[PDB]
Amino acid sequence: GFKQDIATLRGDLRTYAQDIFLAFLNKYPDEKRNFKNYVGKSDQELKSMAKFGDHTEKVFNLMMEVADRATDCVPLASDASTLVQMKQHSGLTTGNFEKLFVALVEYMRASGQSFDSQSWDRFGKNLVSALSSAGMK
């Protein structure tokens, strides 16, 4: 299930982090407006760009931390406060996170792997709820 999926993603994190974020940017091309330096690049060119690789892996590093600290796919309130407070997240509405998890769940369903996609769906919803409580509009 969910706990084994955290280990599976961590075992090849840079690839999963990049492939899931590309899934997200290609499903929701308007989210590029938060990522001006990614506009007008193919997936292969994005994988060539320093901030892309390094920022995507740091995002997923923290995402797997928040997943690991969760109980029954409910993140800690402290982890929601961190995500809301962070300067880099000034722009952001819960909708942005909801779209990221919609793309993450679709990626997992399309893989031949026994990912617990329902758990990730619940995780995304619960994190969105936690982000709202901690004040994100």
Ligand X SMILES: Cc1cc(Br)ccc1O
Q: Which residues are annotated as a binding site for heme b?
A: 36-37, 51, 55, 58, 88-89, 97
- The reply to whether 59 sits near ligand MH0 by the rule CB under 6 A is yes
Task: Return d(Cα 25, Cα 32) in angstroms, integer.
Answer: 7
Binding to ligand X by CB under 6 A, coded x per residue (else -) over 60-99, reads: ----------------------------------------
In sequence order, which residues have a C-beta less than 8 Å from that of residue 2 and are 6 or more positions away?
67, 70, 73, 116, 119, 120, 123
Binding to ligand X by CB under 6 A, coded x per residue (else -) over 24-63, reads: -------------------------------xx--x----
Task: Return d(Cα 41, Cα 122) in angstroms, integer.
Answer: 32
Q: Which does 21 bind (CB under 5 to 8 A by kind): ligand MH0, ligand X, none?
A: ligand X
3-state class of 74 per DSSP? strand
Whether residue 84 contacts residue 75, with contact meaning beta carbons closer than 8 Å, is answered with: no
- Per CB under 6 A, residues contacting ligand X are 21, 55-56, 59, 100
